[PDB]
């Protein structure tokens, strides 16, 4: 059964036909999580170094133009972010790169900031609910684009690399929340930064920084107090120290 031919015949994406305990770890993660902290900030005009301490995990979700088919950030803007100034010497990054030139310019970024790519996480979008919706292609595109990539980067010394959900409605720019589960399940540390998050993505265990946030509660010394001794090196996947 050739699902590519079927897609050409019917408009049903091949991924429409994909089918489909230790969740104690999930509960450890939740008990480890710092209170949610968040800060409204125009990251273009903002001294990134004010965000202390250095982060174990950075989730970077710049608002690309391609997300608005029907302020956007160019890869020119993104590449100029001083991301290496706030990353811990051992740290991880998750960069949403879209599905176009971002797959190349995002790799340049990761190298610019001193990371190496260890994983390529694909968010594959099903169209079970609108097989009769054709895609207006990027001029350079050879194929209808039905996925987005989140690149994982490492610097210093259970889950699969796929997320499958239904294609969100036009104008919905949200990424699948499953990326957070993948990230948290790595147990990489508890200093977790989400750049370009929104009110709707605020989440325990995370510091969210973005221009559209309506409220802020970030205090650098309050934030640093969550990781002062004896809690300096917890993975996020262990018990609190008594």
């Amino acid at each position: 059964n050739d699902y590519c031919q079927h897609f050409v015949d019917t408009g049903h994406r091949p991924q429409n036909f994909i089918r489909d305990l230790i969740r104690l770890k999930d509960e450890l993660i939740a008990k480890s999580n710092t209170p949610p902290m968040y800060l409204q900030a125009d990251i273009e005009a903002f001294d990134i170094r004010e965000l202390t301490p250095k982060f174990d995990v950075i989730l970077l979700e710049p608002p690309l133009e391609e997300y608005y088919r029907e302020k956007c950030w160019t890869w020119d803007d993104i590449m100029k972010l001083e991301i290496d100034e706030i990353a811990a010497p051992r740290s991880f990054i998750f960069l949403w790169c879209g599905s176009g030139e971002g797959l190349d310019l995002g790799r340049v970024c990761l190298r610019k900031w001193g990371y190496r790519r260890c994983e390529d996480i694909c968010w594959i979008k099903t169209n079970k609910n609108n097989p009769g919706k054709t895609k207006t292609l990027d001029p350079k595109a050879v194929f209808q684009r039905t996925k987005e990539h989140c690149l994982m980067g490492i610097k210093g010394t259970v889950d699969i690399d796929l997320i499958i959900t239904e294609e969100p409605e036009i104008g919905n720019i949200e990424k699948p929340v499953e990326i957070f589960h993948i990230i948290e399940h790595f147990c990489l540390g508890r200093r977790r930064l989400h750049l370009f998050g929104r009110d709707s993505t605020i989440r325990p265990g995370w510091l969210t920084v973005g221009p559209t946030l309506t409220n802020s509660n970030y205090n650098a010394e309050t934030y640093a107090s969550y990781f002062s001794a004896p809690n300096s090196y917890l993975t996020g996947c262990t018990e609190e120290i008594e």
């Binding site: 050739d2 699902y3 590519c4 031919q5 897609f7 050409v8 994406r13 091949p14 991924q15 036909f17 994909i18 089918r19 489909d20 599905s99 797959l103 190349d104 790799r107 790519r117 260890c118 994983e119 390529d120 996480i121 694909c122 594959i124 895609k135 292609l137 350079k140 595109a141 050879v142 194929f143 209808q144 684009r145 039905t146 996925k147 990539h149 994982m152 889950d159 699969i160 690399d161 796929l162 993948i182 790595f186």
Partner: protein
């Protein structure tokens, strides 16, 4: 000449200028990641891919650090990467089958060279769902996507095996059974360049 053609050879040493120009190139290279018939990074870079096309598309399978090295070769050979196919690997019941995450997919960079005219861009989408056959066997769906993209044109596969030979394609690999060429222009240029049927340096 439409039916399948092939050349058992060391792709490092074959003079690919005898083969003419192709609307589509596919390569599935033996990258030097984490060896068997492996090519080093410099050998990959030095492959004379540039002579193979003037206007058309290259399909380049990549994994591990070849995701980046394949982008290097692609750009060095003169291509812009314009798409990236992923093949979600399933079993016969459509269930999905790098030390941080398990891998559910393989990647195929799509590069463009020149200004391809008359291709059916946008017919297929960039996700393949298909059953794993045997190790390092790519899915046959890619040939269908390529045929719908560029129907009836000449194509060439690098590092193919005998199961890979297809009509409209010339397959190169060191595990093919001899030479089998039917296109007269190719046959002529092959006899002229290789009067004794041997491919050495």
């Amino acid at each position: 000449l439409f039916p399948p053609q092939w050349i058992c050879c060391d792709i490092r040493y074959l003079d690919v200028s005898i083969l003419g120009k192709f609307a589509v190139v596919m390569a599935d290279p033996p990258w030097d990641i984490h060896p068997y018939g492996t090519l080093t990074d410099d050998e990959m870079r030095r492959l004379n891919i540039p002579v193979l096309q003037d206007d058309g598309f290259l399909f380049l399978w990549v994994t591990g650090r070849a995701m980046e090295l394949g982008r290097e070769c692609l750009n060095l050979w003169g291509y812009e990467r314009v798409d990236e196919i992923i093949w979600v690997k399933t079993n016969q019941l459509q269930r999905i089958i790098g030390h941080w995450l398990n891998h559910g997919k393989e990647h195929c960079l799509v590069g463009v060279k020149g200004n391809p005219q008359g291709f059916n861009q946008g017919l297929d989408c960039d996700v393949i769902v298909a059953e794993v056959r045997s190790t390092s066997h790519k899915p046959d769906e890619i040939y269908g996507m390529i045929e719908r993209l560029s129907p009836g044109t000449r194509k060439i596969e690098l590092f193919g095996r005998p199961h890979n030979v297809q009509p409209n394609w010339i397959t190169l690999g060191n595990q093919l059974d001899g030479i089998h060429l039917l296109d007269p222009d190719v046959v002529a240029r092959f006899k002229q360049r290789y009067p004794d049927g041997i491919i050495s340096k």
